[PDB]
């Protein structure tokens, strides 16, 4: 399969519906062993042995350094490689410009943006031991367009942000052979809007979980610094 | 199997080392019935045989029309469908801005954008008919960067009108859920001996040039159903080197 | 006075409406002497001869390599020099994937593309010699955004291959000074309701982003593709 | 006169080399009353007066909420509008992804994103009573082509960031006529330098008088059907 021996490591995948199990699914599917971060252990925990055999569940706050690194070195010590990382962790809120506050702000920046980050960093030692990897980042069209889904400006900054930092780290470890991708996924399930998608539907978790799939596998061995659109030609440019 | 029971038709794919070639030997190892078409019957013929058994070669310039509607007829009576068109003909030329002559202009165009547009149209009616498809131009970096690579600037303005050719068929035929997207390869070894290789590829940050595998790679998952909410999309497979 | 002492050469600027003569008024305005280019000579002339004095109007179509030599060789042989070439002739036509014909493909493609190549091949001697220039070059948002506005898709090509040509010619003219940039200007006068700005762009916006690019303003700009579709594309 | 009538409040213009006072001074010559803001209340004030009279010179941190409503507050009292915001202010710090701290990451992320977003804040009220505005954001060529110039990753973020709260503002705000768009500069004033330099076909690096008139471009009507746009000022660095 396309993740045949491959370990890979998903934040944010202990929702049912979410974009995350989406992708932990399809990656077990195809041969990968995975292990789910999220925020509560025991979810984690019953995601990773829903996926199957081989799995691991552990807790998380992205954006906590200290939480990070136990749980790198727990997902380390048992399978003794990360070859893909899926920075999926994310939230949003529907506020608008005027109303941000400063934990608004900082609440849905560190999760994507500085969790991308902290994740990232504890993460690339291991890929750079190891002859390299794969991480994938997940932005968002809002980042592209400005907003206007559901997201208000602060979560189309944090997206862009990642994209941002994204195209620095596929820059900074391509020689290191730790490619560096992200995806810009349109309106998800997880009216006015499906009039402006060519395709006539709203996208589905496995739709990301399959460009992830692309992105953290073989397939796309030549692409760093992507950011690979998933909505339904909803932004064509 | 990601290509299981599909027929995909694939232009320029009778030369030995080139994308066209490693797109088809991939598509096939996917599952997929071929229909290879290039210049040349028997070489065309050759290379769908060396990929299996059930595969095609037709001979068709896709400049010309009534070429590429009579292929086209010929693979629709054995097939009855094309789910994939791969429009991956296409031909380079080294010469600068101020050397390009009017044949030259129009020989670059031809093979790609004329091409592209000759061949969707000749495969559109059948997609409709059958419920959708998917649609994969070939473009290039030289198109985003403004060369600066092989190709002069005719090949740039070719391979960026493929992109723009591409994306208004994809906001056009949404609707019958025909996905057109767009592959821009970097430097991609086929058929490096200049010192103006250590500056390119110093600019390439996996280090390496592309292969020929590496786009087929991209078409294919463009081809395939692990792309199902994609149109519209140009997707870089140049290694870093042009990060936008 | 941004263009003052300045030569600009616009193709395209006979029609009183379009976007070349409102380019030509402005910059006529800001100080330059304008050389109109369109394909009937007693139009080009008469519009070169309502910006004031000092202006020239001449016959050619950018699709034909002797002519388009023919007129700037006289605009040489006057002026000494062509600071600025506003590459705005263009065509467009609303017919649909399926119904292009070669016809078709070749009169839309020949005056965009084809003509912006011979136009900058025509003039980029000049330049070479004299230090720089700035050439500008005119796309569409359909050439982003695939079409869906008029232009049929070999209108988006035209205008998609006009930004991969003028990048193309802005990273080999460099380093001659020689500043290659395209403007893309969305709906210039349903479609309403999806701007931003509430609003149709006017021809007066496409040339004012065009005198930026063709001023000093933007000297250290060359490669760029310069958005005028008042929020209808954002990316 | 570009900006007759004008008034543009400009972040980060007090220092003397830098795009912020290039922005002021060429403002200033197209007839607009600048208003500096800054850290040091002595530096702005005098950076104002060296552009001429009329103008005005306020100290604030971009990032501090309190701060920034009480200089829009002084400023608005005076002038009575604000036409045009540059959000100019932002600082860089070459560090790899693995040295980047929680301090770091703070410090960079809240002079470009938090400030741009503050300072957005305080001044599109007044906007949207007085009938509109032009909004410019400060963004690099790192957040395009990721880093490889001279800030770190989070550097490349922050102002990536910045580009997607610009286009966020300028979908929300455009029934408002306010206009928010993005200046995305190269390489502005040895190895690392000649090495890029080699990469910019122009074969100069930028000055900030460069940008400063993509800037004016943006602030004043030449560009009045423009927003949401990402304006590149790198002398062909980046071609895209
Ligand atoms: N429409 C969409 O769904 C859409 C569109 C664009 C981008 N995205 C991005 O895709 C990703 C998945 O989206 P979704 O729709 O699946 O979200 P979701 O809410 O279903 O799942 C996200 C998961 O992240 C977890 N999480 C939240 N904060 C965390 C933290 N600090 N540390 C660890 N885990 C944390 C949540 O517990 C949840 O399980 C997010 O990054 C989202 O922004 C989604
Ligand atoms: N470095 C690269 O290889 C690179 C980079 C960017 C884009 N591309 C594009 O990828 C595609 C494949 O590249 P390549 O390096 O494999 O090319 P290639 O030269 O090996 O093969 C191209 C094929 O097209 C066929 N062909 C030429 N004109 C034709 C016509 N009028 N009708 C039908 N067939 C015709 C040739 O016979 C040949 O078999 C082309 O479109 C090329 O422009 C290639
Ligand atoms: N909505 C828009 O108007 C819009 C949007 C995007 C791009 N554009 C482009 O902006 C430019 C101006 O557009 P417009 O609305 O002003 O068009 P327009 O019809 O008013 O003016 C075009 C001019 O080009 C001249 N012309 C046509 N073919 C020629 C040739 N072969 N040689 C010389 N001159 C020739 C015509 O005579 C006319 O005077 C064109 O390139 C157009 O495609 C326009
Ligand atoms: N090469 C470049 O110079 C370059 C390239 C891309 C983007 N930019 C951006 O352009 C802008 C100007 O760049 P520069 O080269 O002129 O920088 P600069 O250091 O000369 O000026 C920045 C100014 O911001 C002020 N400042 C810092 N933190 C502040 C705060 N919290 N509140 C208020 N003022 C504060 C400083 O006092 C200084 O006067 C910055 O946003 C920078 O990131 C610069």
Redesign the interface.
């Known amino acids: 399969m396309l993740l045949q021996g491959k370990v890979a490591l998903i934040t944010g995948a202990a929702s049912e519906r979410g974009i995350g199990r989406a992708t932990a699914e399809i990656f077990a599917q195809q041969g990968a062993k995975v292990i789910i971060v999220d925020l509560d252990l025991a979810q984690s925990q019953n995601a990773a042995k829903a996926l199957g055999e081989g799995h691991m569940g552990l807790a998380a706050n992205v954006a906590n ?1 200290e939480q990070v690194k136990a749980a790198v070195e727990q997902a380390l010590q048992h399978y003794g490689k990360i070859d893909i990382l899926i920075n999926n962790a994310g939230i949003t809120q529907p506020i ?3 109303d ?1 506050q ?1 934990s608004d ?1 900082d609440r849905v ?1 560190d999760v994507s ?2 969790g991308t ?1 902290i994740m ?2 504890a993460v ?2 291991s890929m750079k031991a190891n002859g390299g990897g794969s991480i994938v980042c997940l932005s968002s069209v ?7 889904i559901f997201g ?3 979560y ?20 290191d ?1 730790i ?1 560096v991708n992200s995806l810009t996924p ?1 309106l998800i399930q997880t009216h006015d809007i499906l009039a402006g ?5 709203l ?2 978790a496995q ?1 990301v979980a ?2 992830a ?2 992105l953290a596998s ?9 950011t ?6 909803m ?3």
């Open positions: 350094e608008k410009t005027l941000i400063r702000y920046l943006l500085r980050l990232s960093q690339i030692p809002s980042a592209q367009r400005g907003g206007g208000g400006p602060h189309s900054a944090a997206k862009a942000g990642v994209l941002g930092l994204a195209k620095a780290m596929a820059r900074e470890f391509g020689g052979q490619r349109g998608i060519p395709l006539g539907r996208g589905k739709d399959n460009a799939l692309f073989d397939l796309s061995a030549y692409l760093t610094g992507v690979l659109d998933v909505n339904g030609g932004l064509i440019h």
